[PDB]
Design a protein around this ligand. Structure first.
Ligand SMILES: Nc1ncnc2c1ncn2[C@@H]1O[C@H](COP(=O)(O)OP(=O)(O)O)[C@@H](O)[C@H]1O
Lengths: 577, 167, 177, 113, 189
């Protein structure tokens, strides 16, 4: 025992354990102590702390632990397994066996463009935006071997005398150490990665980054697309002095005390009955079908009676399967078409926020990702976007102005959901409850639309599987042409229109509306009542069943709900003749 | 007129299709009418209990029968898998079906099957000790009855919290 | 079951203090100890009128000996006036205004309070087979059992339908609830 | 327990020890239960169990497992009771229900916690 | 269906816990107006020779009998469910401050039934006894009041005018101020 300084016991000698028992004040709740006892409500096997109680206790240890932190934390492992195991039993009647835990630390941040040898082996707060990282494989700490039969005591998370020798004379040097892993221990890993900030010249420079090391409990916690504050360690991996013209080496860090950002109102993504009153006692009003014809364009005029046909769209129809095979097309889609200038871009762009979707078109997902990664050259996939749309739907332009490769998967999803693969020798036959809104700047507008059928030069199929195709124009109406000539200076100027539609009776509140829907589309198996008009006009019946869930009713009739019929007469005049 | 519940007609309204020892006669709410007052012994013979709640299993009217969750394949190995078995909210009348029905079936085997699930509480709620945090963490793996005292389980401790000090 | 059912109760006990109402209490005299129930020291110390010193079990030696004595207690233990979860609540609130050693005090009490419950799951992890007529108070304390009082007993009846039913109720060869 | 306590209280009209002038609420019990019902279901008001019916009872469950304040004969002091009562104690107890031991607390030999 | 309707009952009291705007006796019509509408179904075969004494009405006797059986004890609740937390605030106050908004006959019957309690309470002769206010040691009798946005405005107690919400404050004696505690009042005296 080296009782001069750097003393090897102090912490577990008495100090930190007992400070923790000094973490003990009146209200009889001032504790970092029964924290684990509420972890033992489940056996989470970890605990949280600060770095500003030790400051509230002393000014002596905070500059001390920073030298040997990753030593202190397994010192704390020892502290715990000595302490709580005292608490596993008052008097001699309880202990099955001990176990192991982790500790979580946490104040004020830093950046990355300032940190080097000067601040090495030092614990820091910084922030970026995550990119991607690995899964979880494996680790352990100890086991033993035939050759000596001693535990594989390792400090850090070389390779040895034989000791299969003392049988009289015989030696056996040169290392016959054959590990017996059934004797072993075990830990976790992820090996993480992130990119530095988006505000600190990532443009004229390139973004630098960090490599990381997860341990026990902290994987399955973090997916990229996030923004975090963390602590780590400033360490490297190689040893030294035609690479390295003299001595060059590589950067990384560790994991310690992540604390993430959960910024406010994004996260009904990852992580009341009064609101149900708001749902229903508003739903009792029979004023929602055509009321919201001034809603989905909270800043635009037009599409009014076509917003009348969105009212059925997202609510969906019904996948009324049968005793025999089918799972027919409950899902429903739309088509729109016309020239630029009608703001149909912004119509889809602003719609992004209004359940799950993406808005890109042509040459810039698609199909599968049957490629490799870095890690022992695996081949593992990413799927399609029926993957990413199975109740979520999409709004996507430029069918025609996109590669002709990824067009067998259009009929292989809109008609049947008859999806399949053959890249490697197999049919991953995934499926999904998908639907789509379509837009285009296709050939020659209303001069083409009203008359016959020549829009796409490969198929007439695109009028069959969809129904509601209402034209986009830049019609000349001189009374409104000047308005739309000055419907574009208020848009062009002054940055005012954030929530101008908020005052409206019930044609706003994005969150409540999305939740309106995402309850509504999970009520029951609604239907209708007893009650060129050909087979795919009729196969509109989806909209018939829709008004059950639009009035949030079970049932409805044909011709009160032929509102849809009278709205479809907008489309049928395009391709009646 | 019972050990009540707010849902007292979601008491005996769970349905089972136990067969018939006998022919049939005019179930009324069914397609019965001037169409059929007679069928075979054994049929998809739906039984929302309340009418047959004291209707003489011993008498030759209907049959020994089980809904297959209540059959051994779940239950008799859910007493072996009585370890981290889940109940969710899946068939909520499952502390209380057998408090009535499982004798009424007359296979003299199934009452014991139940409790050894609920015998586990003497070594289950060792984990159930306390409240760390929010009002909604994992509050959805319950029965119609355990939840009540579980809330109560929190409750005495929640105000045992104020027993301490001003807290 | 309460925070103040005990304070309905435990403060009724009395101790000789330092500073006539009818009662075994005597009149009050300067410099002269007086045994009082403990719901006046409220009305003295907070009234900035007088001090008080504790009973004898209140020390860091007698119960720094008990720390090992109760390891006999496969059943139960030494019980110095049974109420050291209540008085210490109020004592340690105001007594340490001038009293020394209010800490190992505060230590041990949680170092004995939480613990004897930590057994209590364990002994309760021995209950099997409706073992209704086996139990334990054998040297129990005062302020503990309320923390299980509402939970299991308002459970066990809906168990004891099948647990306690055996020794007066019967059916065919299978068991009865 | 307005329900069938009339039957128990009609057994002996239990004297000063059991109830108290508890008997005044009995007259108001039926009055408030009748008057109110006068506008509940009165077009075709009850038909066979038309009085103070049989099926309503508040609390006959006697097995609410009771803790016993041991302040009595410590040794196995055995008394009139149908379940097991072995192993008596002045400190300890064997926990029990109310029905079978309804005797000691009419005697007040034994006690409650 | 045949009275599974109290699953609908559950929402009427939602805001009405300690932030009650007002209550409704409502929603009760066809759950009431069917009940002996369907007695006519219950009486269709009530002692009928339709089958001359056989099995075929016992399974639906249960329908005849269950139908009531649920109607009653739910309809116990419609007052009992309503008697419970109203008794509680009616413990928080006597009829000093009744509801801010044949139930009055049952309330008057309950008020007469509570008399028994009042007779023994306070003395052999009886006192409507303070149980829910003035743990005050009583001090001088004439100083004013303060609240925390009370509502209902029933203070009929011996004052000039109080206007019972926060700053219901006038020269109000002890006889006045004997009303309420925890319905939005006692930040202050
Ligand atoms: N009624 C209108 N209100 C606001 N902006 C309009 C309106 N009509 C046209 N615009 C203008 O149209 C432009 C967008 O055209 P865009 O939607 O991109 O055509 P496309 O959809 O074919 O790409 C916007 O910059 C906007 O200023």
């Amino acid at each position: 025992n080296q009782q001069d300084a750097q003393i090897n016991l102090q912490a577990v000698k008495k100090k930190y354990k007992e400070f923790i028992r000094t973490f003990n004040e009146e209200n009889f709740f001032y504790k970092y102590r029964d924290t684990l006892k509420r972890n033992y409500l489940n056996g989470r096997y970890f605990l949280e702390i600060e770095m500003e109680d030790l400051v509230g206790f002393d000014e002596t240890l905070a500059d001390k632990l920073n030298k040997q932190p990753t030593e202190h934390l397994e010192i704390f492992e020892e502290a715990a397994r000595e302490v709580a195991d005292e608490i596993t039993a008052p008097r001699p009647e309880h202990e099955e066996h001990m176990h192991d835990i982790q500790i979580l630390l946490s104040a004020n941040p830093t950046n990355i463009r300032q940190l080097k040898s000067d601040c090495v082996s030092k614990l820091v707060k910084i922030a970026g935006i995550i990119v991607a990282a690995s899964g979880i494989s494996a680790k352990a700490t100890r086991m033993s071997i035939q050759c000596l039969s001693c535990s594989t005591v390792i400090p850090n998370l070389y390779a040895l005398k034989c000791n299969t020798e003392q049988a009289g004379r015989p030696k056996c040097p040169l290392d016959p150490f054959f590990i017996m892993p059934d004797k072993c221990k075990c830990v976790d890993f992820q090996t993480l990665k992130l990119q530095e900030l988006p505000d600190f010249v990532p443009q004229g420079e390139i973004p630098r980054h960090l490599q990381l090391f997860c341990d026990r409990s902290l994987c399955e916690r973090v997916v990229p697309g996030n923004r975090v504050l963390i602590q780590g360690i400033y360490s490297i991996r190689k040893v030294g002095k035609e690479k390295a013209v003299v001595g060059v080496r590589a950067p990384y860090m560790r994991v310690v005390g992540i604390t993430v950002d959960s910024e406010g109102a994004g996260a009904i993504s990852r992580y009341t009955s009064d609101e149900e009153e708001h749902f229903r006692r508003m739903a009792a009003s029979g004023d929602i079908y055509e009321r919201l014809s001034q809603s989905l364009a909270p800043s635009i005029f037009g599409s009014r009676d076509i917003k009348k046909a969105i009212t059925c769209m997202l609510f969906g129809g019904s996948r009324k399967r049968l005793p025999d095979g089918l799972c027919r097309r409950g899902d429903i889609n739309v088509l729109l078409l016309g020239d630029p200038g009608t703001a149909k871009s912004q119509l889809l762009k602003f719609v992004e926020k209004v359940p799950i979707a993406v808005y890109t078109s042509g040459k810039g997902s698609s199909t599968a990702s049957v490629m490799k990664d870095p890690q022992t050259r695996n081949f593992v996939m990413e799927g399609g976007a029926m993957v990413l749309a199975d109740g979520g739907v999409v709004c996507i332009d430029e069918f025609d102005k996109m590669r002709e490769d990824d067009r067998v998967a259009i009929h292989e999803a809109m008609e049947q959901q008859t999806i399949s693969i053959a890249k490697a020798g197999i049919t991953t036959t995934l499926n999904s409850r998908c639907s789509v809104l379509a837009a285009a700047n296709s050939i020659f507008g209303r001069w083409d639309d009203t008359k016959g059928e020549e829009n796409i030069d490969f198929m007439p199929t695109i009028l069959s599987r969809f129904d509601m195709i209402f034209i986009v124009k830049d019609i000349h109406d001189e009374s409104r042409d000047i308005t739309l000539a000055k419907h574009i200076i208020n848009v062009h100027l002054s940055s005012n229109k954030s929530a101008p539609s908020e005052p409206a009776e019930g044609e706003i509140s994005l969150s409540t509306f999305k939740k309106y829907i995402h309850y509504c589309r999970t009520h029951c198996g609604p239907r209708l009542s007893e009650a060129p008009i050909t087979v795919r006009q009729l196969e509109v019946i989806r909209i018939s069943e829709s008004l059950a869930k639009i009035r949030l009713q079970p049932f409805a009739t044909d011709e009160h709900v032929n509102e849809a019929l009278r709205l479809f007469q907008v489309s049928t005049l395009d391709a009646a003749m | 007129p019972n050990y009540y519940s707010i849902e007292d007609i979601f008491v005996t309204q769970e349905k089972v299709e136990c067969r018939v020892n006998t022919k049939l006669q005019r179930m009324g709410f069914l397609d019965s009418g001037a169409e059929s007052d007679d069928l075979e012994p054994g049929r998809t013979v739906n039984l929302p209990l309340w009418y047959i709640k004291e209707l003489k299993v011993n008498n030759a009217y209907f049959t020994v029968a089980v809904p297959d969750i209540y059959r051994n394949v779940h239950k008799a190995v859910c007493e072996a898998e009585t370890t981290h078995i889940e109940l969710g909210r899946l068939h909520p009348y499952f502390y209380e079906f057998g408090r009535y029905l499982t004798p009424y079936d007359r296979n003299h085997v199934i009452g014991r099957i139940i409790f050894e699930t609920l015998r586990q509480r003497v070594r289950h709620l060792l984990d159930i000790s306390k409240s760390d945090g929010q009002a909604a963490k994992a509050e959805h793996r319950l029965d119609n009855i355990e939840a009540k005292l579980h809330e109560a389980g929190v409750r005495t401790n929640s105000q045992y919290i104020e027993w301490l000090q001003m807290t | 079951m309460d925070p103040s059912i005990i304070e309905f109760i435990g403060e009724k006990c009395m101790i000789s203090i330092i500073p006539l109402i009818y009662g075994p209490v005597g009149p009050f005299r300067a410099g002269f100890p007086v045994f009082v129930p403990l719901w006046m020291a409220t009305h003295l110390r907070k009234q900035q009128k007088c001090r008080i010193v504790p009973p004898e079990w209140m020390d860091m030696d007698i119960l720094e000996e008990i720390k090992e004595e109760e390891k006999r207690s496969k059943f139960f233990t030494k019980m110095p006036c049974e109420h050291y979860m209540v008085v210490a609540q109020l004592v340690m609130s105001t007594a340490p205004d001038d009293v020394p050693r209010c800490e190992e005090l505060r230590t041990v009490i949680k170092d004995i309070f939480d613990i004897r419950e930590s057994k209590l799951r364990t002994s309760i992890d021995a209950f099997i087979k409706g073992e209704g007529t086996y139990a334990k108070l054998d040297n129990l304390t005062l302020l503990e059992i309320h923390s299980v009082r509402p939970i299991l007993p308002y459970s066990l009846d809906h168990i004891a339908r099948y647990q306690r039913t055996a020794t007066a109720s019967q059916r065919d060869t299978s068991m009865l609830s | 327990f307005t329900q069938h306590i009339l039957n128990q209280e009609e057994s002996r009209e239990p004297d000063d020890k059991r109830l108290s002038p508890e008997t005044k609420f009995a007259q108001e019990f039926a009055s408030n239960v009748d008057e109110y019902f006068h506008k509940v279901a009165t077009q075709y008001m009850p038909n066979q169990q038309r009085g103070e019916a049989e099926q309503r009872i508040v609390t006959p469950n006697l097995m609410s497992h009771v803790f016993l304040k041991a302040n009595v004969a410590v040794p196995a002091v055995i008394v009139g009771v149908d379940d097991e009562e072995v192993d008596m104690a002045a400190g300890s107890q064997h926990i029990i229900p109310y029905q079978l031991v309804a005797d000691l607390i009419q005697n007040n030999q034994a006690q409650l916690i | 269906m045949f009275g599974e309707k109290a699953f609908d009952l559950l929402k009427e009291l939602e805001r009405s816990s300690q932030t009650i705007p007002a209550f409704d006796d409502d929603g009760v019509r066809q759950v009431l107006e069917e009940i002996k509408a369907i007695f006519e179904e219950n009486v269709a075969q009530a002692s009928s020779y339709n089958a001359s004494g056989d099995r075929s009405l016992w399974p639906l006797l249960n329908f005849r009998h269950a139908a009531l059986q649920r109607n009653k004890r739910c309809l116990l609740a419609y007052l009992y469910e309503r008697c419970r937390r109203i008794k509680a605030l009616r413990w928080e106050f006597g009829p000093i401050i009744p509801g801010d908004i044949p139930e009055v006959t049952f309330f008057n019957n309950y008020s007469k039934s509570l008399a028994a309690y009042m007779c023994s309470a306070g003395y052999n002769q009886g006192l409507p006894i303070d149980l829910t206010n003035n743990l005050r040691p009583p001090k001088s009798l004439y100083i004013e009041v303060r609240c925390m946005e009370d509502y209902g405005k029933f203070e009929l107690d011996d004052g000039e005018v109080i206007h019972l919400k926060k700053n219901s404050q006038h020269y109000l004696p002890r006889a006045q101020v004997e009303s309420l505690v925890r319905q939005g009042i006692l930040h202050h005296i």
